[PDB]
Design a protein around this nucleic acid. Structure first.
Ligand SMILES: CO[C@H]1[C@@H](O)[C@H](O)[C@H](OC[C@@]23C[C@@H]4[C@H](C)CC[C@H]4[C@@]4(C=O)C[C@@H]2C[C@H](C(C)C)[C@@]34C(=O)O)O[C@@H]1C
Ligand SMILES: Nc1nc2c(ncn2[C@@H]2O[C@H](COP(=O)(O)OP(=O)(O)OP(=O)(O)O)[C@@H](O)[C@H]2O)c(=O)[nH]1
Ligand SMILES: [Mg+2]
Ligand SMILES: [Mg+2]
Ligand SMILES: [Mg+2]
Ligand SMILES: [Zn+2]
Lengths: 52, 259, 129, 197, 129, 191, 158
RNA sequence: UUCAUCUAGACAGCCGGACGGUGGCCAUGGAAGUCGGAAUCCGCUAAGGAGUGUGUAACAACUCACCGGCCGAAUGAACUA
């Protein structure tokens, strides 16, 4: 098991993320456009699905 | 498969010493005991044969992993024992696993035991009817043993409380309950303090880690780090015997023989 | 047969009554499984002193295959179910439409029994007058 | 928009030229419930007006022409503060003003003014809550069906913010290092400001 | 272990792993014969949910006999009474109808004109004159 | 949109000297000396009063003036790095297997060795770039501290430790093992 | 012998069950069945409407005292000839109840309500009736509200 | 191109509050802002929706609209090619 603070720290990098709908790119949680050129920097983003 | 699917009876004969028969709060006569031991299955899919086992028995050996702690089945199997009014004794197993895998340095092992007993005692406290009251399991009183079944070694706080009387001449009745919990030997002062007190700097270690876990840690450290020049120094200090070929054994296999 | 086939024929399923001994934390998993299998939660209870709940519900026998394994999976092995037949519940859907929810289970029954696939209509067993 | 602001300017004008004194009471960490209680206590006795510091300064500055006396107020209108217009004995007003101390709950990630020590006394909560105690390392022995902490353990130090797990247990045990009150800043009275104390 | 209502031997167990071991013992040592396992066949009850909108008729093969009847949804509580022994086929008409009329709202004349219970002579289906 | 003149301000404290060639910036302070090559940016430095530098872009586009502000950030990072320093605090996150991280030497290269990550028998090695100081701080459990003058070097070496401990073939939402920067600040406290 | 507090929402006139007692009345052990009949005695006045039930349980002397509530009182002010919950789901709560009870109901509300003037508390309690859907003085409750704000239904400031 | 916020302090940033009637009505086995239908109210208000989401079996507990504290000059939105 992980301490709550260390689990929050690890989640800040592994879970607290956005995902592009078009190319599945992992983006910052406050991003408005995907950084990838393949999707044309589309604004279609979702939050990264939380476990369970 | 590697699992237990049934409940098979086995009979055991046990001789003891006179000194610990006196340390019995039960009307008894003699020096020998006969054990009728049942090996219940752990799976919930076989949780009916343990009910059959519990009805046919009066005591329960609650084996608990120090790694996984109190699991769902330990919750369940102990609940049915308490429903049958079975007095449980708890043994903490897989301490060897924690000492090679988790690398717990000095206090984490004590805290895992502390958390384990608290979680176990919670189970017996809420599922016990008011006919015994003192059915809580507690290591200083000698109702909890510690060891690794796979390696074939285990100990109790009572066992160490008597082991030091033969070498130090100190009291055992008030050290059996003293070697657990918040108790610090406080070297350089010769006073069993009851708190950290910061040790006026460098907060000191408790009696449990200092007196009980320290010797087994030292044997683990020496054997697993292959300090062949240091192994026999402890072994004679640890009053063991030698054989023609077990001395010619390396680390990870010494634990087999020495403990 | 003609009288039966005109009075909106329907089928009835057996439903189990299940009481489950689950702790405080995993009682939510029971409802998740029950909502998968059309189960109807009847009553909640607390055993005095212990956190173990006691949830009684009506689980249809048809949707009761593998129920405990998924129930164990959702509750982490903490749910302990006891299962026994309670009564019969009528299926609201028509068992005459082969594509209906009741029509598929009766269709399977017809096939495995060696009967015909389509059921003889009310025009049979009825003499026109 | 300037319209709605202008009644507040007008309402501020009305209040200031009716009552004789006011406070510069410092409103920090004060709940909506806390403010209503204080105001409810002061019914009739005094009224409390708090708003956007910028307008408050602005409103006064336009009033200064007709009402120079209030000029001294401006340098003390800083931070979240409210004006308690009163025409009643200052002594009793200040007591009622700083009266509503409330032990605020132990928030997660909240700065701890002092150390947080938990005691080995019994708590009465059933052994079910033992999960919270174990999480924070705190030893606990069950006695008379109640969670009894074995040994004194400090969960939160001084300064270091109270973590989520730490806070959780404190809320359960009703422990909190901070209690908030509508502390004051300055007392203007008839044309003179002076330290409230 | 028991015999189902659909003519199938139904071994029951605590869980999937427990059942797997029990079946393995059955196939290897207990019985000693190769056997196959499938999900049990769930039995259902056919019923009606209307009043036989138009009168059902059937004519005899010799064209001399005609029967006109209807179907009706016997109430749930009455169905339990037949199965639970409140309404006994062995009982006396115009005496068993005293219980059947006052406790179940039916009219005495139809209650008295009862010919049989179905199926098995004591089932929850009724025939009325 | 071709701003005629866009300007940014670089504040120079008393105890540091900034020597700027065409686009070679050399910042010398109490803690050390940093150098950065900026010949790819086409900007203009000019000192005003020996504690203030002005960097300007003339007739620059949106992208040109956007990187002008970046130059100010890069130079200020150099200046604050020789006065206050940089320290990045990283915590070890592990559910079951404790991560064994220490300092190992191979041909005098100051490698950070990683063992027992998720029980792996692989030995991960992270080189320490010159200028980065590695210390494990006691009274904080599972803490590695990286200190140095340049934020670029300190942050990237912290990132190398983080990237070498990425979980493969598992649900990263549950297998949260790794080494993550828990704090990013300066060597000197409360400066 | 300390005064613990508990709150419930048991329907008026009808008894309650251990299902919502044992989680709280279980540790202290006040014989849940005994508690339930106390609740009925409390609710006895308030037949047919859910009401809060104060429990000053000072070592098994449960209060069984109905805590007043705007909603229940407005329903209790309609006099609501006893609702048959079983017969039909989604029964209504309507009527024509006048100003006077709202003045009355407000009176035991002003104590805790922050509506310094009775006019404030009355439009509060009357505001609850707007949610209920009943009528006041044959007119929309919000029409009565705006009628009060225009000074024609002036409240006795007692 | 159009419409908005803005020194009576705009956007962003960080921090504080986010109430009371009230667990609004009805339903629900449980539904307390947050499974649902409908009602989209009042008071205190600088301000708070019969609620923005997370969340609980149901509570709770955070969170957001909403209003403030710090800084002080521009900013935001929707479209056009
Ligand atoms: C407590 O012990 C009981 C209960 O577990 C449960 O009632 C079940 O009973 C079997 C069934 C009994 C049902 C009623 C008699 C009417 C319909 C019967 C079933 C379906 O056809 C439902 C359960 C499950 C069995 C089918 C699906 C094979 C039943 C059967 O016997 O056929 O198993 C044993 C006998
Ligand atoms: N490392 C280590 N492993 C242990 C220890 N004790 C038990 N184990 C492991 O746990 C497994 C299960 O223990 P067993 O005694 O063999 O059987 P069991 O515990 O009864 O398991 P079931 O029969 O399924 O109930 C063994 O295969 C061991 O590998 C221990 O002390 N140390
Ligand atoms: Mg076994
Ligand atoms: Mg996989
Ligand atoms: Mg909900
Ligand atoms: Zn993309």
């Amino acid at each position: 098991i992980i301490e709550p603070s260390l689990k929050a720290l690890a989640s800040k990098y592994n879970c607290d993320k956005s995902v592009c709908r078009k190319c599945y790119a992992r983006l910052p949680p406050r991003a408005t456009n995907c950084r990838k050129r393949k999707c044309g920097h589309t604004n279609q983003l979702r939050p990264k699905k939380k476990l369970k | 498969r590697g699992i237990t699917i049934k409940s098979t009876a086995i009979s055991l004969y046990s001789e003891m010493s006179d000194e610990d028969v006196k340390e019995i709060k039960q009307k008894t006569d003699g020096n020998s005991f006969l054990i009728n031991l049942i090996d219940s299955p752990g799976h919930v899919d076989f949780s009916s044969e343990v009910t059959a086992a519990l009805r046919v028995t009066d005591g329960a050996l609650v084996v608990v992993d120090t790694i996984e702690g109190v699991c769902v089945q330990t919750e369940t199997v102990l609940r049915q024992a308490l429903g049958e009014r079975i007095k449980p004794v708890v043994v903490i197993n897989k301490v060897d696993r924690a000492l090679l895998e988790l690398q717990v340095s000095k206090e984490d092992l004590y805290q895992t035991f502390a958390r384990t007993v608290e979680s176990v005692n919670v189970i017996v406290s809420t599922y016990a009817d008011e006919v015994l009251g003192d059915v809580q399991v507690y290591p200083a009183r000698g109702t909890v043993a510690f060891g690794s079944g796979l390696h074939g070694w285990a100990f109790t706080i009572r066992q160490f409380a008597t082991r030091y009387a033969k070498k130090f001449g100190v009291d055992k009745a008030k050290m059996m309950d003293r070697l657990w919990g918040d108790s610090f030997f406080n070297p350089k002062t010769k006073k069993w303090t009851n708190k950290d007190t910061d040790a006026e700097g460098k907060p000191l270690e408790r009696a449990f880690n200092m007196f009980i876990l320290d010797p087994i840690f030292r044997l683990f450290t020496a054997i697993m780090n292959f300090k062949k020049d240091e192994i026999p120094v402890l072994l004679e200090k640890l009053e063991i015997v030698l054989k023609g070929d077990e001395k010619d054994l390396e680390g990870k296999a010494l634990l087999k023989v020495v403990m | 047969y003609a009288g039966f086939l005109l009075a909106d024929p329907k089928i009835q399923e057996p439903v189990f009554l299940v009481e489950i001994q689950c702790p405080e934390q995993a009682v939510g998993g029971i409802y998740s499984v029950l909502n998968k299998k059309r189960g109807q939660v009847v009553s909640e209870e607390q055993r005095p002193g212990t956190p173990l709940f006691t949830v009684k519900a009506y689980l249809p026998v048809n949707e009761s295959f593998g129920f405990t394994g998924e129930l164990r999976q959702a509750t982490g092995g903490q749910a302990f179910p006891q299962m026994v037949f309670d009564h019969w519940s009528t299926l609201g859907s028509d068992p005459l439409d082969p594509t209906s929810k009741a029509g598929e289970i009766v269709l399977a029954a017809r096939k495995r029994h060696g009967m015909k696939e389509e059921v003889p209509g009310w025009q049979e067993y009825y003499d026109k007058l | 928009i300037r319209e709605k602001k202008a009644e507040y300017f007008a309402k501020l004008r009305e209040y200031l030229e009716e009552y004789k004194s006011l406070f510069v009471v410092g409103v920090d960490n004060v709940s909506s419930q806390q403010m209503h209680e204080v105001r409810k206590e002061l019914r009739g006795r005094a009224v409390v007006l708090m708003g956007k510091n910028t307008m408050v300064r602005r409103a006064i500055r336009g009033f200064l022409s007709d009402l120079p006396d209030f000029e001294k107020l401006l340098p003390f209108v800083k931070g979240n503060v409210g004006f308690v217009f009163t025409n009643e004995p200052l002594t009793e007003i200040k007591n009622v003003i700083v009266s509503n101390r409330v032990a605020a709950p132990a928030r997660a990630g909240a700065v701890a003014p002092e150390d947080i020590w938990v005691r080995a006394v019994n708590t009465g909560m059933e052994p079910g809550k033992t999960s919270f105690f174990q999480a924070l390392g705190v030893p606990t022995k069950i006695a008379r069906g109640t969670i009894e902490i074995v040994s004194d353990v400090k969960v939160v130090d001084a300064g270091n913010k109270v973590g989520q797990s730490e806070a959780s247990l404190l809320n359960l045990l009703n422990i909190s290092p901070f209690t908030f009150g509508l502390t004051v800043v300055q007392v203007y009275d008839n044309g003179q400001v002076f330290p409230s104390s | 272990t028991y015999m189902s209502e659909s003519g199938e031997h139904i071994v029951a167990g605590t869980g999937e792993l427990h059942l797997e071991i029990c079946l393995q013992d059955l196939e290897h040592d207990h019985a000693g014969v190769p056997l196959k396992i499938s999900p049990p066949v769930v039995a259902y009850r056919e019923t009606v949910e209307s009043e036989s909108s138009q009168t059902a008729l059937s004519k005899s093969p010799n064209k001399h006999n005609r029967i006109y009847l209807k179907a009706e949804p016997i109430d749930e509580e009455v169905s339990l009474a037949i199965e639970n022994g409140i309404i006994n086929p062995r009982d006396d008409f115009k005496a068993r109808a005293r219980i059947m009329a006052d406790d179940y709202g039916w009219d005495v004349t139809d209650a008295r004109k009862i010919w049989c219970f179905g199926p098995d002579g004591n089932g929850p289906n009724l025939v009325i004159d | 949109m071709k701003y005629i003149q866009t300007e940014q301000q670089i504040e120079v404290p008393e105890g540091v000297t900034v020597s700027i060639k065409s686009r070679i910036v050399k910042v010398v302070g109490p803690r050390g000396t940093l150098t950065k090559n900026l010949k790819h940016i086409d900007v203009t430095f000019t000192k005003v009063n020996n504690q203030l530098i002005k960097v300007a872009v003339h007739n620059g586009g949106r992208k040109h003036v956007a990187a002008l502000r970046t130059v100010k950030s890069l130079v200020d990072n150099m200046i604050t790095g020789v006065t206050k320093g940089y320290k990045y605090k990283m915590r070890y996150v592990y559910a079951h297997f404790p991560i064994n991280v220490n300092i190992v030497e191979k041909d005098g290269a100051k490698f950070i060795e990683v063992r027992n990550f998720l029980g792996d028998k692989k030995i991960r090695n992270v080189p320490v770039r010159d200028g980065v100081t590695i210390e494990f701080s006691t009274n904080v459990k599972d803490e590695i501290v990286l200190s140095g003058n340049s934020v670029e070097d300190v942050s990237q070496n912290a990132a190398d430790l983080q990237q070498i401990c990425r979980v493969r073939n598992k649900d990263i939402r549950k297998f949260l093992d790794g080494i993550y920067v828990s704090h990013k600040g300066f060597i000197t406290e409360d400066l | 012998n300390e005064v613990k507090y508990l709150y419930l929402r048991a329907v008026g006139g009808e008894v309650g069950a251990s299902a919502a007692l044992a989680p709280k009345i279980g540790p202290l052990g006040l014989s849940p069945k005994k508690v339930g009949e106390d609740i009925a005695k409390a609710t006895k006045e308030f037949k047919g409407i859910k009401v809060t039930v104060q429990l000053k349980i000072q070592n098994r002397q449960a209060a069984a005292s109905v805590v007043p509530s705007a909603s229940s009182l407005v329903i209790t002010a309609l006099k609501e000839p006893p609702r048959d919950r079983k017969k039909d789901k989604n029964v209504k709560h309507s009527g024509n109840i006048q100003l006077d009870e709202i003045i009355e109901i407000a009176r035991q509300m002003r104590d805790k309500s922050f509506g310094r003037t009775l006019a404030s508390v009355t439009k509060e309690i009357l505001g609850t009736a707007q949610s209920v859907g009943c009528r006041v003085d044959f007119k929309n409750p919000h029409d009565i509200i705006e009628g009060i704000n225009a000074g024609e239904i002036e409240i006795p400031e007692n």
